[PDB]
Write an enzyme that holds these catalytic residues in place. Structure first.
Site, PDB file in Angstrom:
ATOM      1  N   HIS A  20       0.844  -1.192   0.000  1.00  0.00           N
ATOM      2  CA  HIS A  20       0.000   0.000   0.000  1.00  0.00           C
ATOM      3  C   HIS A  20       0.884   1.248   0.000  1.00  0.00           C
ATOM      4  O   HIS A  20       1.680   1.448   0.921  1.00  0.00           O
ATOM      5  CB  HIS A  20      -0.963   0.003   1.191  1.00  0.00           C
ATOM      6  N   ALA A  21       0.741   2.069  -1.042  1.00  0.00           N
ATOM      7  CA  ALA A  21       1.638   3.202  -1.304  1.00  0.00           C
ATOM      8  C   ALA A  21       1.652   4.250  -0.190  1.00  0.00           C
ATOM      9  O   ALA A  21       0.619   4.527   0.424  1.00  0.00           O
ATOM     10  CB  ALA A  21       1.285   3.855  -2.640  1.00  0.00           C
ATOM     11  N   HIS A  46      -0.192  11.842  -6.506  1.00  0.00           N
ATOM     12  CA  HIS A  46      -0.715  11.966  -5.144  1.00  0.00           C
ATOM     13  C   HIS A  46       0.411  11.851  -4.117  1.00  0.00           C
ATOM     14  O   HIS A  46       0.554  12.710  -3.244  1.00  0.00           O
ATOM     15  CB  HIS A  46      -1.787  10.907  -4.850  1.00  0.00           C
ATOM     16  N   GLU A  47       1.199  10.785  -4.228  1.00  0.00           N
ATOM     17  CA  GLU A  47       2.309  10.535  -3.312  1.00  0.00           C
ATOM     18  C   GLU A  47       3.394  11.609  -3.395  1.00  0.00           C
ATOM     19  O   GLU A  47       3.958  12.002  -2.371  1.00  0.00           O
ATOM     20  CB  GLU A  47       2.910   9.147  -3.549  1.00  0.00           C
ATOM     21  N   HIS A  78       2.611  14.685  -1.318  1.00  0.00           N
ATOM     22  CA  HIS A  78       3.060  14.585   0.070  1.00  0.00           C
ATOM     23  C   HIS A  78       4.524  15.008   0.173  1.00  0.00           C
ATOM     24  O   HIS A  78       4.891  15.779   1.057  1.00  0.00           O
ATOM     25  CB  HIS A  78       2.914  13.157   0.598  1.00  0.00           C
ATOM     26  N   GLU A  81      -3.436  15.603   1.830  1.00  0.00           N
ATOM     27  CA  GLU A  81      -4.000  14.684   0.844  1.00  0.00           C
ATOM     28  C   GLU A  81      -4.392  15.369  -0.462  1.00  0.00           C
ATOM     29  O   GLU A  81      -4.450  14.724  -1.514  1.00  0.00           O
ATOM     30  CB  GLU A  81      -5.211  13.950   1.439  1.00  0.00           C
ATOM     31  N   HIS A  83      -6.732   1.207   5.642  1.00  0.00           N
ATOM     32  CA  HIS A  83      -6.705   2.265   6.655  1.00  0.00           C
ATOM     33  C   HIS A  83      -7.334   1.861   7.977  1.00  0.00           C
ATOM     34  O   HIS A  83      -6.960   2.380   9.029  1.00  0.00           O
ATOM     35  CB  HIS A  83      -7.385   3.520   6.114  1.00  0.00           C
ATOM     36  N   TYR A  94      -9.416  12.338   3.710  1.00  0.00           N
ATOM     37  CA  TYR A  94      -9.692  12.133   2.290  1.00  0.00           C
ATOM     38  C   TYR A  94     -11.003  12.781   1.847  1.00  0.00           C
ATOM     39  O   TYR A  94     -11.091  13.277   0.722  1.00  0.00           O
ATOM     40  CB  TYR A  94      -9.658  10.650   1.925  1.00  0.00           C
TER      41      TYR A  94
HETATM   42  C1  LIG Z   1      -0.641   5.193   5.019  1.00  0.00           C
HETATM   43  C2  LIG Z   1      -1.647   5.511   3.919  1.00  0.00           C
HETATM   44  C3  LIG Z   1      -0.994   6.358   2.827  1.00  0.00           C
HETATM   45  C4  LIG Z   1      -2.013   6.728   1.741  1.00  0.00           C
HETATM   46  N1  LIG Z   1      -1.898   5.784   0.612  1.00  0.00           N
HETATM   47  C5  LIG Z   1      -2.712   6.093  -0.582  1.00  0.00           C
HETATM   48  C6  LIG Z   1      -2.334   5.081  -1.674  1.00  0.00           C
HETATM   49  C7  LIG Z   1      -4.218   5.951  -0.278  1.00  0.00           C
HETATM   50  O1  LIG Z   1      -4.566   5.152   0.591  1.00  0.00           O
HETATM   51  N2  LIG Z   1      -5.189   6.618  -0.938  1.00  0.00           N
HETATM   52  C8  LIG Z   1      -6.625   6.438  -0.592  1.00  0.00           C
HETATM   53  C9  LIG Z   1      -7.056   4.959  -0.738  1.00  0.00           C
HETATM   54  O2  LIG Z   1      -6.413   4.238  -1.535  1.00  0.00           O
HETATM   55  O3  LIG Z   1      -8.013   4.578  -0.038  1.00  0.00           O
HETATM   56  C10 LIG Z   1      -7.387   7.310  -1.592  1.00  0.00           C
HETATM   57  C11 LIG Z   1      -6.372   8.418  -1.908  1.00  0.00           C
HETATM   58  C12 LIG Z   1      -6.808   9.159  -3.189  1.00  0.00           C
HETATM   59  C13 LIG Z   1      -5.738   9.199  -4.285  1.00  0.00           C
HETATM   60  C14 LIG Z   1      -5.160   7.823  -4.623  1.00  0.00           C
HETATM   61  C15 LIG Z   1      -4.730   7.008  -3.384  1.00  0.00           C
HETATM   62  C16 LIG Z   1      -5.028   7.655  -1.999  1.00  0.00           C
HETATM   63  C17 LIG Z   1      -1.779   8.172   1.287  1.00  0.00           C
HETATM   64  O4  LIG Z   1      -0.747   8.421   0.628  1.00  0.00           O
HETATM   65  O5  LIG Z   1      -2.655   9.003   1.601  1.00  0.00           O
HETATM   66 ZN   LIG Z   2      -2.105  10.623   0.730  1.00  0.00          ZN
END
Ligand SMILES: CCC[C@H](N[C@@H](C)C(=O)N1[C@H](C(=O)O)C[C@@H]2CCCC[C@@H]21)C(=O)O
Ligand SMILES: [Zn+2]
Ligand SMILES: *[C@@H]1O[C@H](CO)[C@@H](O[C@@H]2O[C@H](CO)[C@@H](O[C@@H]3O[C@H](CO[C@H]4O[C@H](CO)[C@@H](O)[C@H](O)[C@@H]4O)[C@@H](O)[C@H](O[C@H]4O[C@H](CO[C@@H]5O[C@H](CO)[C@@H](O)[C@H](O)[C@@H]5O)[C@@H](O)[C@H](O)[C@@H]4O)[C@@H]3O)[C@H](O)[C@H]2NC(C)=O)[C@H](O)[C@H]1NC(C)=O
Ligand SMILES: *[C@@H]1O[C@H](CO)[C@@H](O)[C@H](O)[C@H]1NC(C)=O
Ligand SMILES: *[C@@H]1O[C@H](CO)[C@@H](O)[C@H](O)[C@H]1NC(C)=O
Length: 598
Positions: free
Chosen positions: A321-322, A351-352, A355, A379, A481, A491
């Protein structure tokens, strides 16, 4: 006397912040090592360092009482001291904190280690969520195959950790009360520094809810034509396994079967990415290019040297999980992403990297301010860029979208595709925390915990499980999550405020004019805009140094969270869709689900 003390306090904070950054660096390194490489040894190391830091935080919180900080002249100094009083989980007794850490890693590692057997081959049992199971969910239109993978995953990622989740709720509650919050709900909501925050979100959600109902209705109608009425009823909740996502949080994977105009273009650039030989490295370099084109900060060498951007090919367990990581020094920032070459993954990369940009923008701030203005701000950043990356305008520039004619019908297709992600997500995200808030607040009896989850999913999203569930199952932790104890309201806030940022950035970039047909919001590309970048710099550099309305004000002069911008974006879709549902006599709304037996 107070004048002399406030001078001493300023020096105290300066040293303590630097010490906290350095101590947090060590905890973060152990957390990184565990997430990149799940072992009993690394778990032990991660949790022991955290226990050590928690003990230090207790001393810090104790030491704050030696300063008359509430009496000080400086709003800045008072704000820093207040941040230091907030212990969170570290308020727990030594033994309780250790047990919580053990409970949390038990849940996260369970999720990360989930493996299921192949639907067609019962001897092949090494299918992980990322990428094997998610590939089936996104690609298969065999409803029984989909139902099989849904059940296998939820049983293993959800039900398996019920007892751990129960103990987690207890300790989360105990920690919140030791910080004098009523529950973990209030502890989470404290991050938004606004005593009417829940009501504000209810008001915004209520305004957008009718548009979601229209989208829901149309998708159900289109799914009936595909699967037939034995699989999908006109009047009931949609069976969630047909929506192209394990948690039905985003429906974009089924766009090819539900698009308003199937004979007109629908943007799906995954095939062209593969054809052009895209790699994870290229995708991240393209993300870097987008940020720097806006006169924002280039990714440092540490990022490239230390990040993990592809799933390891050895036998090891890890969290795929990214996530993006701040190590609290200078320029030591990292991403861990099991990157795949898809359109949605290109968005996830941005998205990443959003951050990461935030980390770099505020790394000069004292430690306590090295975080988002509120969790939703963090976010939103990358999603603002992903909105422009997703436009036909941008995708043509980078050669990923070819022979595209942007007529009225193609525009509706694109707006609908965007909504299948952005509008659909809103009730989903709200329910993730509405659920956990209700458990934290003690509003649901333990005997009713599972169907309380599915009741919310029904009430807000109008979706249901593919098979009958009961209180013998426990499905909530099947979402990352929830197993990983990551607050989700961030989110919902993000998906609202990202349109505020996007609209303003587009106006600044000269890319949006509501009175100009040639500059629609849904085709704005902020690539190359230093003016849009300047707004980001002004806001992001603040970190958490000021309450979030001041951070919003620095971006666009506004101080209020508002659904105006998201509604403005989707207004052409709303008009068309309301008319299309009437044209097709589409049933709107749903009966109460029969899929969770009390
Ligand atoms: C520890 C959680 C990290 C989280 N990881 C991402 C992959 C994540 O969970 N999500 C959320 C998800 O996958 O439920 C939605 C959010 C909308 C854009 C794409 C991915 C984003 C983040 O970087 O906010
Ligand atoms: Zn994020
Ligand atoms: C969550 O809320 C909790 C309350 O529900 C809170 O717990 C309270 O914290 C108080 C500390 O701020 C604490 O107050 C102290 O009480 C001592 C005596 O308590 C005993 O009796 C209680 C019942 O009668 C029992 O419940 C206790 O267990 C104890 O047995 C006092 O001795 C103590 O006093 C000293 O401190 C004050 C300092 O206050 C300031 O001092 C400066 C000087 O620099 C002044 O300028 C300033 O004006 C101000 O007075 C001195 O005044 C005094 O001279 C003594 O030195 C103090 O009152 C309280 O006991 C405790 N529990 C309860 C039930 O009240 C938690 O702290 C909250 N948690 C968080 C994280 O915020
Ligand atoms: C994973 O951790 C183990 C010890 O827990 C270590 O020996 C090993 O080198 C790590 N594996 C990788 C691929 O880094
Ligand atoms: C780029 O950003 C810097 C500050 O970071 C600013 O001074 C400069 O004017 C910006 N460049 C342009 C072309 O606006």
């Amino acid at each position: 006397a107070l004048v002399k003390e406030e001078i001493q306090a300023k020096e105290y904070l300066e040293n303590l912040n630097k010490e906290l950054a350095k101590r947090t660096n060590v905890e973060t390194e152990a957390a990184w090592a565990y997430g990149s490489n799940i072992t009993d040894e690394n778990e032990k190391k991660k949790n022991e360092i955290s226990a050590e830091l928690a003990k230090f935080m207790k001393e810090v919180a104790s030491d704050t009482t030696k300063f008359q900080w509430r009496s000080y002249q400086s709003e800045d100094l008072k704000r820093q001291f207040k941040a230091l009083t907030k212990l969170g989980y570290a308020a727990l007794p030594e033994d309780d904190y250790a047990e919580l850490l053990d409970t949390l890693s038990a849940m996260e590692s369970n999720f990360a280690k989930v493996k299921v057997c192949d639907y067609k081959d019962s001897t092949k049992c090494d299918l992980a969520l990322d990428p094997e199971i998610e590939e089936v969910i996104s690609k298969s239109r065999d409803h029984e195959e989909l139902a099989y993978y849904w059940r296998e995953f939820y049983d293993k990622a959800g039900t398996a950790v019920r007892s751990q989740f129960e103990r987690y709720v207890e300790l989360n509650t105990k920690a919140a009360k030791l910080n004098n919050f009523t529950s973990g709900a209030e502890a989470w909501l404290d991050e938004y520094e606004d005593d009417t925050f829940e009501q504000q979100l209810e008001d915004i959600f209520a305004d957008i809810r009718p548009l979601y109902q229209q989208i829901h209705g149309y998708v159900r109608f289109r799914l009936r034509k595909h699967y037939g009425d034995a699989v999908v009823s006109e009047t009931g909740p949609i069976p969630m396994h047909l929506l192209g996502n394990m948690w039905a949080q985003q429906w974009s994977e089924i766009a090819d079967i539900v698009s308003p105009f199937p004979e007109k273009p629908l943007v799906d650039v995954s095939a062209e990415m593969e054809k052009q030989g895209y790699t994870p490295l290229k995708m991240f370099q393209m993300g870097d290019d987008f940020f720097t084109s806006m006169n924002l900060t280039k990714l440092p060498q540490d990022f490239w040297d230390k990040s993990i951007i592809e799933k390891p090919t050895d036998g090891r367990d890890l969290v795929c999980h990214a996530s993006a990581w701040d190590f609290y020094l200078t320029d030591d920032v990292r991403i861990k992403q099991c990157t795949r070459v898809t359109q949605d993954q290109l968005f996830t990369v941005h998205h990443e990297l959003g951050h990461i940009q935030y980390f770099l923008q505020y790394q000069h701030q004292p430690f306590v301010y090295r975080t988002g203005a509120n969790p939703g701000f963090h976010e939103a950043v990358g999603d603002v860029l992903s909105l422009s990356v997703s436009t036909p305008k941008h995708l043509e520039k980078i050669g990923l979208l070819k022979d595209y004619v942007r007529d009225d019908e193609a525009r509706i297709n694109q707006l609908f595709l965007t909504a299948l992600d952005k509008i659909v997500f809103l009730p989903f995200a709200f329910t993730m925390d509405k659920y956990r808030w209700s458990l934290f607040r003690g509003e649901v009896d333990k005997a009713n915990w599972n169907c309380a989850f599915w009741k919310l999913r029904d009430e807000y999203s109008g979706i249901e499980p593919p098979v009958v569930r009961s209180e013998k199952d426990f499905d909530a932790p099947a979402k990352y999550h929830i197993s990983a104890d990551v607050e989700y309201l961030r989110y919902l806030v993000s998906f609202i405020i990202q349109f505020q940022f996007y609209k303003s950035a587009c106006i600044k970039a000269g890319q949006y004019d509501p009175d100009n047909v040639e500059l629609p919001l849904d085709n704005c590309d902020i690539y190359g805009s230093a003016a849009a970048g300047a707004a980001f710099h002004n806001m992001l550099s603040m970190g958490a140094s000021k309450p979030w309305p001041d951070a919003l004000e620095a971006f666009n002069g506004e101080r209020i969270m508002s659904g105006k911008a998201i509604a403005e974006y989707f207004e052409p879709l709303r008009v068309w869709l309301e008319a299309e549902n009437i044209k097709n006599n589409v049933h709107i709304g749903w009966t109460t689900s029969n899929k969770c037996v009390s």
